[PDB]
Structure 1
């Protein structure tokens, strides 16, 4: 066997250049092709470089593979660093008797801008009420940093039972989303004037309110 050795983590601001190295422990780096893979948390990996320095279509030209024979290493160079480049990066080569991966490098993009959540509150449907259940959901999307706290109200009073809120996950736009859901009986839903979801993010609060409908 041989090993591919990568730094554990690198941290840089947007717009800068980052270099991630991949040093072969034994045998020459050039005796087999080196691939690079990018993996965002929550997603499968993608190929960003194959055959040392070839870029698949759709991969931005900011990504460049190279080989340095004197340091017995391969490098992935990302110029013009963007928020979307925050990921784990893995180099990969062959032992002939095996496919071998580097240990992975976490690339942190520092200084991502703050983004307030979009908050949308949905009442229980007819169909759900007809099945003798009542759930409210408060959708909280497109926010950064990825921490919120949620409070529910029945009329103006705090609800302290039947609340769950999901752990925030980064979505395809590189911001977080979550939902808070409140489980009620149909009778609870109908015996109040309204329910409200109040979302606090970075010290600012957003409130939405829904009421039982009338035809």
Structure 2
């Protein structure tokens, strides 16, 4: 079947308009209806759009669904942004019994100034190595909003095996920190020329690389 591709995050100040795209991988966006669901943090989801642009009763007309056949995409547009619009937004369609969801888009209504993350990539420590561990840590500090995406590369190939990322937490400077760790064996860590941590925040992606050496 097809995928539905949503940006990981979006942000704006109160009173502004924000748009969340939902691109269909293969086939025609207009072949099947698209729904949008809102989840506020610590809340149950609710439908804000069904059948591309239908608004259920109780959902203000600040929320608007559209289809662009040229780009093969759905969009949810929210005008007059209010703090309660801060939530995760998922688009959803079908082909046959195949329900297809997007990955979700975290919408932040800016409570403070944007801050790009400090990203530090650490190669394995001597002590963990002699315990037969080559865990790498990617430390991500001092960012707002609190939404990041982390991907790892062995040389050039995406890694999915062994990646863990913490949920961003508010630190004493009122900015967010989190860590991504890749649990490698020594044999894996040494069997490559370099590893990489790619951090995406506010659509902007930074990339750090470490290589094996001996000191």
TM-score range, shorter chain: 0.5 to 0.7
More displaced stretch, 75-84 vs 117-126: 117-126
Contact kept? 2:163, 2:182, Cα under 8 Å: yes
Q: C-alpha deviations, 1:93-127, integer Å up to 9, x for none?
A: 01213111001000001037999999999999999
Cα distance 1:83–1:122, how it changes in 2: closer, same or farther (>3 A)?
farther
Q: CA deviation at 1:40?
A: 0.7
Q: CA deviation at 1:198?
A: 42
Q: Which has the larger radius of gyration?
A: 1
Inter-partner Cα distance in structure 2 for 1:167 and 1:114: 18
Inter-partner Cα distance in structure 2 for 1:214 and 1:40: 49
Inter-partner Cα distance in structure 2 for 1:126 and 1:151: 25
Structure 1: unaligned runs, 5 residues or longer: none
Indicate the RMSD between aligned Cα atoms, in angstroms. Answer: 12.7
Inter-partner Cα distance in structure 2 for 1:92 and 1:155: 34
Contact kept? 1:117, 1:143, Cα under 8 Å: yes
Inter-partner Cα distance in structure 2 for 1:146 and 1:95: 34
TM-score, structure 2 as length reference? 0.53
Q: CA deviation at 1:41?
A: 1.1
Contact kept? 1:12, 1:110, Cα under 8 Å: yes
Structure 2: unaligned runs, 5 residues or longer: none
Q: CA deviation at 1:180?
A: 31
Q: CA deviation at 1:140?
A: 30
Q: CA deviation at 1:43?
A: 1.1
Matches within 5 A, 1:22-171: 22-111=22-111
More displaced stretch, 198-207 vs 92-101: 198-207
Question: Per the alignment, in what secondary structure is the counterpart of residue 184 of structure 1?
Answer: coil
More displaced stretch, 116-125 vs 31-40: 116-125
Q: CA deviation at 1:132?
A: 53
TM-score, structure 1 as length reference? 0.53
Cα distance 1:214–1:60, how it changes in 2: closer, same or farther (>3 A)?
farther
Inter-partner Cα distance in structure 2 for 1:211 and 1:5: 33
Contact kept? 2:9, 2:147, Cα under 8 Å: no
Q: How many residues align?
A: 215
Contact kept? 1:41, 1:170, Cα under 8 Å: no
Q: CA deviation at 1:3?
A: 0.3
Inter-partner Cα distance in structure 1 for 2:95 and 2:154: 64
Contact kept? 1:83, 1:174, Cα under 8 Å: no
Cα distance 1:179–1:42, how it changes in 2: closer, same or farther (>3 A)?
farther
More displaced stretch, 172-181 vs 153-162: 153-162
Q: CA deviation at 1:44?
A: 1.1
Inter-partner Cα distance in structure 2 for 1:34 and 1:81: 22
